[PDB]
Amino acid sequence: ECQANQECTVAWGVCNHAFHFHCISRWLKTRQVCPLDNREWEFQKY
Amino acid sequence: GLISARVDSHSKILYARDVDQRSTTFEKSLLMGKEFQRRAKAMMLRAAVLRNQIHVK
Amino acid sequence: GSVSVALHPLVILNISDHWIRMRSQEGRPVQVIGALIGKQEGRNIEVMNSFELLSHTVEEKIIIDKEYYYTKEEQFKQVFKELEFLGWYTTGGPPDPSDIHVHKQVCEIIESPLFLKLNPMTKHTDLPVSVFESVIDIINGEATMLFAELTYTLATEEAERIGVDHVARMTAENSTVAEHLIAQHSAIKMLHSRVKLILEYVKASEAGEVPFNHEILREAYALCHCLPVLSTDKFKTDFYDQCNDVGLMAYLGTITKTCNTMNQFVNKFNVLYDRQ
Amino acid sequence: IEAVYTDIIQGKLDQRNQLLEVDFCIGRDIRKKDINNIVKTLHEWCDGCEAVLLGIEQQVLRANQYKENHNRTQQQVEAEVTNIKKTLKA
Amino acid sequence: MLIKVKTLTGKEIEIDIEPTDKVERIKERVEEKEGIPPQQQRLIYSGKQMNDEKTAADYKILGGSVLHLVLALRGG
Amino acid sequence: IIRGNQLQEFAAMLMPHQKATTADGSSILDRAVIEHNLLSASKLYNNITFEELGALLEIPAAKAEKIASQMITEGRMNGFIDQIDGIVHFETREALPTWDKQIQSLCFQVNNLLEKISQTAPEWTAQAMEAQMA
Amino acid sequence: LVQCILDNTIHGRIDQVNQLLELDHQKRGGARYTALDKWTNQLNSLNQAVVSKLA
Amino acid sequence: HIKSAIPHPLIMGVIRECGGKMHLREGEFEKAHTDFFEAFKNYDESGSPRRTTCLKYLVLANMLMKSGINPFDSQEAKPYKNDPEILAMTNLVSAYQNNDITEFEKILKTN
Amino acid sequence: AQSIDEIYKYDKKQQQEILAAKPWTKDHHYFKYCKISALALLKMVMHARSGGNLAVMGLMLGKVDGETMIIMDSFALPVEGTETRVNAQAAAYEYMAAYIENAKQVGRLENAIGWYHSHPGYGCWLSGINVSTQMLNQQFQEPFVAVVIDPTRTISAGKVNLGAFRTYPKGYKPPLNKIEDFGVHCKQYYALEVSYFKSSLDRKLLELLWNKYWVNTLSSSSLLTNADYTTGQVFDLSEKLEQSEAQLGDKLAKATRDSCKTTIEAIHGLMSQVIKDKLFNQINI
Amino acid sequence: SAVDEDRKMYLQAAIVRIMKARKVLRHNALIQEVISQSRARFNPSISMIKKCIEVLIDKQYIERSQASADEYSYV
Ligand SMILES: [Zn+2]
Ligand SMILES: [Zn+2]
């Protein structure tokens, strides 16, 4: 998303899955779970 | 009104009719206006006959 | 041209509001004097705001109440940091001896106060609003200083320009259709003026008046070839679509208004001819 | 297309209707015998502008007259009803 | 002496206390009669907020010299 | 629109891996140029048939439609495809907005012409404005 | 195609006689017409309410 | 119903695999996906034989819930992507996501 | 002239009569209209933008007429507020005490009518502290109104974004679309309908300084830019008419006024289109 | 630590401003908005953000919704 049109960093979860911060931000506005393990998402590390 | 369609019995084909929202809105509004005018012109006459206290004994 | 002046579309509003307030309070238009403040960035004099000033009339002359000026200056200096005294404004006609008399008192505060005249009754060649500066003449003997008119620019920020654009787009005992048609009239007048100027240039360059430019004449030919604008059959159908849509809306609004009127008539008929 | 590239004309090609729609075209050379055409076209434009302005002024006057008539009728009705209310309080 | 306290909205309240009267009794009387909390009121004289200094001695109060009552104004 | 004749020199200087085909006989260069030509023709055409779209793109009749539909469903270009008529529509103008744009262009032309007249004969322009105001 | 259309997944209809699928690149801003229809219905109801009050 | 237990990561593998299987049989693919992911995580943490069986089931559940997000994008499942018993499944996902009928059918027919 | 010269003529007899009657003590839903002058609006916008992302606020001058609050001027209090909170500790009070007297000296007869306050980036609404302050100011200064202006939203959207609100008194016992636009105290206050007015001389100089945007109006072409707004007005008017006929068994007058306003704006757009067609399309055949 | 106090104050101010901007939010949305706003100066720590949220809840700046405990409302 920043590639096609623009700081991009990593955003880890309690499962330590490390998606893009912007990608997980866009994902969280529709789904409340982690994309990979399908568990409740909680932010951790940045 | 369960199915919005039209039967063509020559070639035996069931076509689907598409209601033109613009045209049906216009015709419904015009019919409502005509009904309004008729109702109002009847109400005016009723007011005229009640003001004169006209009734059949 | 000596010093350049930049004006904001707030000082004029303040002056107009002050003048109308005094006119309404006294019942007739009166002469008002106020103080112009702003920034002094060297060569540019940016008038940003203004406040009403207290003046007393003695015989026929006017004296600015200096103590009120000092109190209001100490009062506003804690709200507008980078805004100091710039000059004074007055509503009226031409610069008269009364104006120069008031300037003779204002000039003891700053080195060169400005003057901003607002004339709502202008029907002559000079602009209704004007800016003046006192010039010390070199004439020997009793040298009466002159009042030189200085031009002003139309510098405006994006935000304030958008604000006045919004306040101008909106409308509203004047009739609404009259105001809308006057708004259209103001723009058609400008378009007509531009087209008439171009037509006069073409007519003059035709025979002998102005040395004609081939480029300008060709651009005028293109402008003439630009009409009619979108005379296609497709446009002529969408235009009548819009006309019929607005006509249906007008019919429904008329029906609603007649419904309200007949409701009122029925109510009054029932409260007069109440029969049980 | 190659004429559109030279920017003399700007437009689009409609193959379905077999049409070329032109939004803008440059002004070709004008000789000293058809300037009267420019004068006539600009005069017609000015006449149309004058007629539109006159019609707008006439409609503004008519709307103001209608508004003033409505206000006068409302105030006259108000005066009559308060007069009848005053004489009814005997 | 007769103070003519006024709010910025134009509401005027007339109060008649003695030129030499203990502040506590007048304070208790106003809070018991009109119930005005002291937490939001501010009394301004000549553009200066009044503090706990000497009163009715340095000030030349004459028939209610416009004592301004201002309420608390906070927002966000 | 880039014809192939001006790309023969460009294809020679490409690095070898950039010269690889796409398992259909067409290399990378004459697929990017095909997409570029089709996108640029989307701006010069209101609509175009498959045969004509392939005539100016050298792709015969069918892969033209395939590439046109592939540039859509990705947002790379606007337009739809009527396969019954074999026509790609790129952009439709809704008459009234076009009327607005043409009126704005006419007013801009008037303003530019007046500016040119003022900058050409300033004294005449000043005297003409003075006479007009009267 | 029938299954996908019945599931609201595909916005289109099928020409059985021509063996076609016509998509639904339609339905522009017609909310104005629905608003006008609601206005007309409310006006009719208000008509019947006001006219039939007493006379 | 138990929420206060600290069991071996083989018990949590068995019961989570059972839950994933029952969710798959009933048709709740969304719950089967997370159940199989938890079972595979526990089996990978401790164990070996019953490891590349819950990964296949997790792949199938992910493909049965409209796909999106590669199962072999997490830390746990990535090393086993090239496993001989998981190569068919990762190829099936690579064909399923970024959909292409030819590759999917070829992988099906070959395996 | 004359009739349009009104609202600027300030009389003290009517003000004293409405302030002594105190009719708002009985009807809590009294004030429904807020008529703000152009000068007050402009000063509010410039002051709000001057503070940037820090909150700034000030006072208002004006009067009351019937059920309408008229705003004729704006203040500028010397308050140094944080990015989300303004306090007005000790200098604002003395400043507003002195400014009223200074304005009395020059001829400003309008008294304090309310307070305006900036919300830099959080819409226009009354928070808990705003509600508390406004309700206190209403309880002790009965004619009052709280105006909130968003500078950043106004600049971003290109439209003036401000609102006027009045709180209900404590203990006023009498859907889901009023919880995100407003705060949790949304039921503790109500929004007055806000309208703007200008004077004859102000509009005279505004039309005089209107010489660059004639192209914008000659191709403005409403009924397309305000199509969504018009259909929104229409489907709100249908519900208003439904409420009016339910009352029938004056809401009907208000519904008729709204219908007239929407229809008049539509016919104004059509008049613009007709004028443009006459100007540009009936020339050169 | 001066930097720790500065970061805590910045986070509290950002949380208050965001809560005024939205007037209602979820925990994940609040954390995401706080991170996106304060990434200009430093990388926030989720523990510090949660501590600031708790200390603002205690200070009656924001409140937890009765229906759901993961939703915050500005008061
Ligand atoms: Zn990014
Ligand atoms: Zn996870």
UniProtKB/Swiss-Prot annotation, chain A:
Keywords: Acetylation, Cytoplasm, DNA damage, DNA repair, Host-virus interaction, Metal-binding, Nucleus, Phosphoprotein, Transferase, Ubl conjugation pathway, Zinc, Zinc-finger. One of its GO terms (biological process) is RNA polymerase II transcription initiation surveillance. It comes from the Eukaryota. The keyword Ribosomal protein does not apply. GO terms for molecular function: cullin family protein binding; molecular adaptor activity; NEDD8 ligase activity; NEDD8 transferase activity; protein-containing complex binding; RNA polymerase II-specific DNA-binding transcription factor binding; ubiquitin protein ligase activity; ubiquitin protein ligase binding. A zinc finger (RING-type) spans 1-38. Widely expressed. The keyword DNA repair applies. Zn(2+) 1 binds at residues 20, 23. Zn(2+) 2 binds at residues 2, 8, 22. Zn(2+) 3 binds at residues 15, 17, 34, 37. It is found in: Cytoplasm; Nucleus. GO terms for cellular component: Cul2-RING ubiquitin ligase complex; Cul3-RING ubiquitin ligase complex; Cul4-RING E3 ubiquitin ligase complex; Cul4A-RING E3 ubiquitin ligase complex; Cul4B-RING E3 ubiquitin ligase complex; Cul5-RING ubiquitin ligase complex; Cul7-RING ubiquitin ligase complex; cullin-RING ubiquitin ligase complex. The RING-type zinc finger domain is essential for ubiquitin ligase activity. It coordinates an additional third zinc ion. Belongs to the RING-box family. This is E3 ubiquitin-protein ligase RBX1. It comes from Homo sapiens (Human). The chain holds residues 55 to 106 of 108 of the full protein.
UniProtKB/Swiss-Prot annotation, chain C:
Its main location: nucleus. Widely expressed. It is found in: Nucleus; Cytoplasm; Cytoplasm, Perinuclear region. Keywords: Cytoplasm, Host-virus interaction, Nucleus, Signalosome. GO terms for cellular component: COP9 signalosome; cytoplasm; cytosol; nucleoplasm; nucleus; perinuclear region of cytoplasm. Coiled coil: none annotated. It holds the Pfam family MitMem_reg. Component of the CSN complex, composed of COPS1/GPS1, COPS2, COPS3, COPS4, COPS5, COPS6, COPS7 (COPS7A or COPS7B), COPS8 and COPS9 isoform 1. In the complex, it probably interacts directly with COPS2, COPS4, COPS5, COPS7 (COPS7A or COPS7B) and COPS9 isoform 1. Interacts with the translation initiation factor EIF3S6. Interacts weakly with RBX1. Directly interacts with COP1 and 14-3-3 protein sigma/SFN. Interacts with ERCC6. This is COP9 signalosome complex subunit 6. It comes from Homo sapiens (Human).
From Swiss-Prot, chain E:
The keyword Iron-sulfur does not apply. GO terms for cellular component: cytoplasm; cytosol; extracellular exosome; glutamatergic synapse; nucleoplasm; nucleus; postsynapse. It is found in: Nucleus. GO terms for biological process: anatomical structure morphogenesis; modification-dependent protein catabolic process; protein localization; protein modification process; protein neddylation; proteolysis; regulation of postsynapse assembly; regulation of proteolysis. Cleavage of precursor form by UCHL3 or SENP8 is necessary for function. InterPro entries: Nedd8-like, Ubiquitin-like_dom, Ubiquitin-like_domsf, Ubiquitin_CS, Ubiquitin_dom, Ubiquitin_ubiquitin-like. GO terms for molecular function: protein tag activity; ubiquitin protein ligase binding. There is a cross-link at residue 76 (Glycyl lysine isopeptide (Gly-Lys) (interchain with K-? in acceptor proteins)). Keywords: Acetylation, Isopeptide bond, Nucleus, Ubl conjugation pathway. The record marks 8, 44 as: Interaction with UBE1C. The keyword Manganese does not apply. Pfam families: ubiquitin (PF00240). The modification N6-acetyllysine is found at residue 48. The modification (Microbial infection) Deamidated glutamine is found at residue 40. Highly expressed in heart, skeletal muscle, spleen, thymus, prostate, testis, ovary, colon and leukocytes. Its main location: nucleus. Residues 70-72 are annotated as: Interaction with UBE1C. Interacts with AHR; interaction is direct. Interacts with NUB1; interaction is direct. Interacts with ESR1. Belongs to the ubiquitin family. This is Ubiquitin-like protein NEDD8.
From Swiss-Prot, chain H:
Disulfide bonds: none annotated. It is found in: Cytoplasm; Nucleus. Transmembrane segments: none annotated. Coiled coil: none annotated. It comes from the Eukaryota. Phosphorylated by CK2 and PKD kinases. Belongs to the CSN2 family. Component of the CSN complex, composed of COPS1/GPS1, COPS2, COPS3, COPS4, COPS5, COPS6, COPS7 (COPS7A or COPS7B), COPS8 and COPS9 isoform 1. In the complex, it probably interacts directly with COPS1, COPS4, COPS5, COPS6 and COPS7 (COPS7A or COPS7B). Specifically interacts with the ligand binding domain of the thyroid receptor (TR). Does not require the presence of thyroid hormone for its interaction. Interacts with CUL1 and CUL2. Interacts with IRF8/ICSBP1 and with nuclear receptors NR2F1 and NR0B1. Interacts with NIF3L1. Essential component of the COP9 signalosome complex (CSN), a complex involved in various cellular and developmental processes. The CSN complex is an essential regulator of the ubiquitin (Ubl) conjugation pathway by mediating the deneddylation of the cullin subunits of SCF-type E3 ligase complexes, leading to decrease the Ubl ligase activity of SCF-type complexes such as SCF, CSA or DDB2. The complex is also involved in phosphorylation of p53/TP53, c-jun/JUN, IkappaBalpha/NFKBIA, ITPK1 and IRF8/ICSBP, possibly via its association with CK2 and PKD kinases. This is COP9 signalosome complex subunit 2. The chain holds residues 223 to 333 of 443 of the full protein.
